[PDB]
């Protein structure tokens, strides 16, 4: 397929969007290596004949291990998808500094570090592509979600920085900015709200298509940006939000 | 990807438009392209599509194009608004007639054609529209006022269309190309290194590269993408 | 008087934001020349001690006449505020072409033309400033308001174009992008809570609040600000 | 003037834009408290009749102490300007993790923490305003300046987050995004002159005072319906790429 025999690294591929991305790449012929804190990642890799590495991306040593083991296992690195991320509820008034720093480490520092590590391996095969999974919440903010909004905002401009600095290595770097996608994490957030039915309706209506997106739909955008079909696209931020950011 | 689907492409005689027409035809689509330039005839023949000589500045001609194209293809599933013109000059030098002509072709025409095409798309349960804007619709350049204003208008019109056509199951997006090596560019030059260095990839883009982005946005693979503006500029807009 | 003795042109100053802008400049000692199609602009001018010109900005001849007569009355032109605008309800599917074209003429072509005309007067005094009143609806769209969305989107990029081309004449050009403001025009459309909830401040803005932003951008305090689009929306565009 | 009797906190006020900002607020009648790691900030405070606090903004304990002592000295806190910042040359390929983290701490975490601390003081006087000094490099990137581009990008969206969360406390939060400003640091780093200047439509570098004027406006009541906004003060740099 579009990625036959290509080595693809996907962070946080145990479930949700990451899992959809890992499966999409496998369906296109890629040799996939994914990591996650969740042991369920093992099953995902088994189903797609890929490799799984249980990794805590908050730790710089673990990030180094993941790229090394993935590179050795796959034999090459062509694509890196920075999908793993976390959040810490609260505005600047109540978020605790340690939790805030942890979100910045996992959501912003990790993608920066992993991109550098992956780039050095891509150099061996003449280049490659990196896709960062940001969010519409990296372009705009929401109440009580300071750490997430700050870190994703940083990820958006980091994507531009990486695009400029890695262009010489023939590595393109882009990001997708999803709107509300029906992943386990979102279904949980909705189900645990005081009025789940109402919440679901409200979230759906944030999009022009009046429905939540599907993980597979975000995966298709990532696949496109990581493919040679997007050869003149780099440093771009692509919203995959069913029209959310087109109107208030 | 588009086997048997009806696709309308404006300004398909050369450059990006021609590449777009060829790309859809390669994917099995029934393509109807229009242009003022007669060479569009050979493009249609080479890809097995239909050519219509149309002056998009004229509203009657726009109505005629969609009617004739719909009849010829049998259905309309995708519309690509690619045709455009420019009128050199700042607000201080541009003449009103030429300014209005640029707005008619670059902004009014896409609005009108989208409405006409949408009515046909309703017959097949929806579809997709892709507008070819420009980085010069998100930013400006010296002495190119009509182009900058019309393309800026096209960018927000894309958002408007996305909102109003969502109920009809029609997605609407736009691509914003940077410097692409088309006849128009390989004419304005007729500078070289300057334009190339405007991008991080340090080279001009190829028409085919913009076409691939257009095909993606027009495809079901972009099912949750609407109202979006995608730069295809080799990293130009990522830095100054 | 931050603008004491300076000549200021304000379009659409009979009511709403335009009226507030005219009053603000007058309060600061400026010689204000405001135009509008509505007759009540006369009373506004009388109350602030300025000059009123009943003009139909859709007419290019009247636009030329306005700047010429206003310049003569004031003795000099230092600032131009393009505030006049109209809308045509409807999506691309229902808007009439003639109405769409008229919205483009008044909302986009008129500001382009007036800026050029005013710039020639500002040259006499070594430069000046132009402030275009765009809208959040020039950066984003809403349902059934295609003409307004497209024209305001064009006005946003035209502001960038003008800033680039007029810098040589030492004329800064910026735009304000107001969110929901409590003007009679808005009060009519409404005839509430939802519109207020669109802003983080949870209230509609006052015309006077938009005027203050306009005066800032038109002042020397904003000497290194040009080609900028400043939202005056109570936080609306900061979140969904 | 616009800030007569108002308590204003300015970070990194020893030199450059921060110094221009402190001087501007004092010029408008404000009671200014500025901090900086550089001891010469004392001179700025003395010149404008304000208060100086030597502070290492990378340290959370010193940040808490700064707001506490500044609030005590001024008697009230109405405005906070997050101006202090640092950079760490290098792309993601060459930057050292520790320096990258330090840049995030000073450029992004510090403004977040300080905004929270200052907001609690503003609540005592019915609200206030916060202005973050971002950069055009928070909206776009440049070569080999990853830490700065990432932190400023985060600061831009943090500005939106703060605006949404502090609105109820009647606190507006906005940011300015300066282009090339002729600070002593920039004047020393400098064909090179012409190139940097030609990045702006005005074809010249901006003055620190010009950025200060925008900050004053956004922090004033004249900007009462402006919050969560990012205002470029770049002489037209971001209006064009050619
Ligand atoms: N679902 C949405 O609506 C939505 C919208 C916008 C952006 N996104 C982004 O999409 C991505 C995935 O979202 P999701 O909904 O699938 O969420 P998710 O909770 O499933 O998170 C992604 C994966 O990251 C893993 N992970 C988190 N911290 C880790 C760490 N320190 N080490 C290793 N693995 C770690 C998690 O275990 C999880 O499997 C994220 O970057 C998220 O910010 C999602
Ligand atoms: N080439 C670039 O670098 C570049 C950059 C940004 C945006 N774009 C956009 O891409 C599109 C195509 O660009 P291009 O470089 O191929 O230019 P082009 O000169 O080849 O123009 C496209 C086609 O439009 C046709 N056309 C123009 N006015 C027409 C009318 N009234 N009726 C019918 N046909 C008409 C022309 O004959 C031409 O074949 C345009 O919308 C342009 O604005 C191009
Ligand atoms: N009110 C809001 O919420 C809001 C929000 C965003 C942007 N805006 C913008 O602010 C500006 C003023 O808005 P407003 O609410 O006061 O509206 P308004 O209805 O009062 O319109 C402004 C003035 O323009 C005049 N005008 C219109 N067409 C004219 C023509 N051809 N010749 C001469 N005068 C003409 C009108 O008579 C009116 O007095 C407009 O540019 C509008 O798009 C307003
Ligand atoms: N100079 C420019 O061209 C330019 C352009 C865009 C944005 N900016 C922004 O404007 C602001 C000021 O820039 P500047 O040019 O005056 O730079 P600067 O080097 O003078 O730095 C500002 C001040 O911050 C202080 N500072 C740095 N780290 C500190 C710490 N840990 N604790 C306490 N004080 C600390 C420095 O001592 C200095 O006095 C910054 O936020 C910068 O990113 C500057």
Automatic annotation (TrEMBL), chain C:
Binding of NAD(+), residues: 15, 17, 36, 38, 56-57, 83, 148, 152, 181, 183
Highest taxon of the lineage: Bacteria
Cited Pfam families: adh_short_C2
CDD domains: SDR_c
GO MF entries: nucleotide binding; oxidoreductase activity, acting on the CH-OH group of donors, NAD or NADP as acceptor
PROSITE patterns to which the protein is assigned, alphabetical: ADH_SHORT
Alphabetically ordered keywords of this record: Nucleotide-binding
Family statement drawn from the similarity comment of this UniProt entry: Belongs to the short-chain dehydrogenases/reductases (SDR) family.
UniProt name for this protein: Oxidoreductase, short-chain dehydrogenase/reductase family
Species: Thermus thermophilus (strain ATCC 27634 / DSM 579 / HB8)
